[PDB]
Design an enzyme around this catalytic site. Structure first.
Site, PDB file in Angstrom:
ATOM      1  CE  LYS A  87      -3.646  -0.904  11.855  1.00 10.53           C
ATOM      2  NZ  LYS A  87      -2.735   0.017  11.137  1.00 10.53           N
ATOM      3  CB  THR A  96       0.358  -6.902  -0.431  1.00 12.56           C
ATOM      4  OG1 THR A  96       0.260  -7.851   0.636  1.00 12.56           O
ATOM      5  CG2 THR A  96      -0.507  -5.699  -0.135  1.00 12.56           C
ATOM      6  CG  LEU A 102       4.099  -8.788   2.809  1.00 10.90           C
ATOM      7  CD1 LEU A 102       4.045  -7.798   3.959  1.00 10.90           C
ATOM      8  CD2 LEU A 102       5.223  -9.795   3.031  1.00 10.90           C
ATOM      9  CE1 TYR A 108      -2.654  -4.349  11.928  1.00  9.93           C
ATOM     10  CE2 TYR A 108      -4.975  -4.675  11.453  1.00  9.93           C
ATOM     11  CZ  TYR A 108      -3.726  -4.239  11.060  1.00  9.93           C
ATOM     12  OH  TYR A 108      -3.569  -3.709   9.814  1.00  9.93           O
ATOM     13  CB  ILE A 161      -0.987  -0.051   1.182  1.00 13.57           C
ATOM     14  CG1 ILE A 161      -2.098  -1.068   0.904  1.00 13.57           C
ATOM     15  CG2 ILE A 161      -1.553   1.319   1.504  1.00 13.57           C
ATOM     16  CD1 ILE A 161      -2.706  -1.655   2.149  1.00 13.57           C
ATOM     17  CG  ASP A 185      11.163   0.309  14.184  1.00 12.33           C
ATOM     18  OD1 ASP A 185      10.042   0.758  14.488  1.00 12.33           O
ATOM     19  OD2 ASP A 185      11.553  -0.833  14.478  1.00 12.33           O
ATOM     20  CB  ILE A 243      -5.155  -4.226   0.117  1.00 17.12           C
ATOM     21  CG1 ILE A 243      -6.158  -3.165   0.584  1.00 17.12           C
ATOM     22  CG2 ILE A 243      -4.378  -3.783  -1.108  1.00 17.12           C
ATOM     23  CD1 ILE A 243      -7.189  -2.768  -0.439  1.00 17.12           C
ATOM     24  NE  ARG A 301      10.445  -1.219  10.736  1.00 12.35           N
ATOM     25  CZ  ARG A 301       9.777  -2.020  11.571  1.00 12.35           C
ATOM     26  NH1 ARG A 301      10.345  -3.109  12.061  1.00 12.35           N
ATOM     27  NH2 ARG A 301       8.536  -1.720  11.922  1.00 12.35           N
TER      28      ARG A 301
END
Ligand SMILES: [Mg+2]
Ligand SMILES: [Mg+2]
Lengths: 251, 251, 251, 251
Positions: free
Chosen positions: A159, A192, A194, A155, A18, A62, A190, A38
């Site tokens: 968020k 990706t 990953l 998470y 993203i 980071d 989304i 990173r």
């Protein structure tokens, strides 16, 4: 085109996925961009893939590193002049219920996902206010800022924090005429590299009971809402939540 | 009456204000109660003011202290038998914009307001699940879990985190048939000795542009919604937000 | 530029104010546009002020008129080819509390504000589905779709209805792969000639307790979010609420 | 017990299901109750099943009938004295997408579900204000007031309208010190004889992707939140949404 004329943007986690799409569309629309990541090997390659150093550069960072935020703003001003635009996009996930969340996992996720957005938002307000830049802070939340996931406890916490903290910053900036807007963007699922690396993930996310559109999005879906929010087109939008999720939160 | 028959409740920050009213109404409704607080002189006096040690006891604890949570659950089981009910009420405020929030202030507020609720919720699920207790975790958020305040940046972050983290825990507990519910309570402005100690605060809170009812609430307003949520009357309520705010968030 | 290449849009109440700005930016971005309004003298002048008949035309229509919706879609197809885009913008207000709302006022407001959006959304789905148009229905709600106003009872009802009805349509269109998106736009206070005609209104709206930015918006603020939603840039956005309100709903 | 001491309640659609459970728990808690329904045979039997005429009576009424609302308030005052409490519970459903909703179906559903709640709320404010009754209007919305269902288009519209209209009424009543509160209750799936009459419905509703608790609720789940809202226990709650849904809206 030229929708971000003269804008100078920092995008955390801008070397992949993203963040890389936001950086790509930002440069296309005339913004100067500093992307963070990173690894220097990934970050320098990512910058070169988007444009020339007069358009986009890489800064190794980071988001959890408070002192490094100072060096990031200093490096971006030296390359491009005063920063107008911050996208707090850098984030990590832990696949645990609240019940099964280790304290070290908890602290590490909140260091990147919450401390990172706090450090970036606080410094961004200080550096961007009262300069007539049409400054915009875009804090990346997610569908997990609105609804629970039983296997994303930490998470969800991070968020939900970004979502409401961003409204505080928005109000303070508005009441003090800082010429700084703060808004949250809430992606659903989304596609990706990953996601492509977790067998079964895209199919699971694409189920109608998850994403009503029956497919997941692409990084450009988040890039375009970020162009709107960075641009002066959104000069009356602050303290708001922009959801791009294929209907996930509508059911 | 007897609406909390057989319930065994822990209430963090139960020695003053809202927590003390929740403890008072819990005992009235037949619950056994362990209240926590920082000072033994205040806490023991508060327990004795509500009832006898067979009804209510005090346990000295900082909600940010992870190891102390273990000792708190152990002490409550020894006094009263298995814990059925947790009210995460202990909290602190910082009167700063995001912009003016020191990192130490940030970390300390999140240690009590977010780590505390995470530690309590995680341990509560482990100790209360699969025992047919009709277990209920009640996480105290506030109006600042829904809307920004420009001078409560860190507080907004913590209250948004508790709000959405609580939904994660609720879903996990529901899907796994743990017989544990997790809900958030969102007070608006409530009159306490602490509010009475800030000259002008109650008048400011009572302005129609803040609280449409034109006055602030009292600790019992929060106690009664907590009795409902602790009771088996709410056995189909989980992952929900209960607002008692005199109309603050309706405008 | 060319962000709406090949799009064919209907904009109800497109002859004045927000609707006229949406029509203006739509034509600028390459869309063909049919604007509606009650008066031919205003509507034809408004069309001519934006562009040539090959770009934009006027169709006289009351959004509450069910049979006229058929004639509106037929007229737009004849002029421009298949309709891809509907903005349900036509609306009226009643300045009454629920308590003081006459039944005739109630029925008339819901005829324009709710029946209108229902008629337009229902017909739009039928005419735009399964044609690969990248079809988008943009239903104009307002801040009054999220929060109460004590003197806009009927208006609140209509805006809450449009908000949630739009999610139903969004889900149905997504699950059936109709290639139709449905989203709501929620303006706060926007400066128009009509606001300029109510002495004191802009100052009242501009108070920090109403609009934190301390000023109201302009029609182009709503036009730009509508360009995003009409464009294929938002192809993963459906069932979502887009707020542009100067911070009104963030506090 | 005696939680509704001296309260005089009207409950529309009080002869079956959720309404009958609210009436049953209201009488148990010391309220006088007038229940409404379409059929005298059902309504008189339902009243007698709960208590004596000094506790509960039946009044035949379609909530869509404006003039009948006057006769309903007059009949309740004659039997019980001044009305303190209104539960707008009467409702109908249409099983259609927005796309497949006939205009007659649309108008009929909004006549009961929206006009009914408007007529009841408007008259209730007029009859209950400024009398020190601790008056409470409880407007029954549903999970369909928060999220779309692709096959409940008109229902979604009506439930979104009730949700936000109720906030308008709440604010007006608060700002004018009317001693009237207005709140919405949002049931998820509740087992009734009517649900028992649709083969497969309870199993479909009980799926984890619908109700995380993996079962549906019972009428008493809605009765208990209504007792809280009718009682003076909720005297600081107005303009708020109370969800009892087994986690439906938390995911
Ligand atoms: Mg959902
Ligand atoms: Mg507000």
């Amino acid at each position: 085109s030229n929708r971000l004329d003269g804008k100078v943007a920092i995008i955390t986690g801008g070397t992949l996925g993203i963040g890389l799409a936001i950086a790509t569309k930002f440069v296309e629309e005339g913004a100067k961009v500093m992307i963070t990541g990173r690894h220097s090997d990934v970050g320098e390659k990512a910058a070169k893939s988007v444009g020339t150093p007069d358009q986009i550069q890489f800064f190794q960072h980071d988001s959890s590193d408070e002192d490094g935020w100072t060096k990031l703003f200093d490096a971006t001003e030296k390359a491009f002049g005063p920063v107008s635009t911050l996208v707090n996009n850098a984030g990590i996930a832990v696949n645990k219920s609240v019940e099964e969340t280790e304290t070290a996992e908890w602290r590490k996720l909140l260091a990147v996902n919450l401390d990172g957005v706090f450090f970036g938002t606080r410094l961004g307000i200080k550096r961007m206010k009262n300069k007539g830049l049409g400054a915009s802070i875009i804090n990346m939340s997610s569908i997990e800022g609105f609804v629970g996931d039983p296997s994303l406890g930490a998470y969800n916490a991070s968020k939900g924090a970004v979502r409401i903290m961003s409204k505080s910053a928005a109000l303070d900036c508005a009441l003090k005429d800082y010429d700084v807007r703060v808004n949250t963007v809430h992606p659903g699922y989304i596609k990706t590299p990953l996601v492509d690396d977790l067998p079964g993930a895209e199919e699971a996310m694409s189920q109608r009971t998850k994403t009503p559109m029956g497919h997941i999005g692409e990084p450009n879906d988040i890039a375009y809402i970020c162009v709107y929010l960075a641009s002066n087109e959104s000069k009356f939008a602050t303290g708001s939540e922009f959801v791009v999720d294929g209907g996930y939160t509508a059911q």
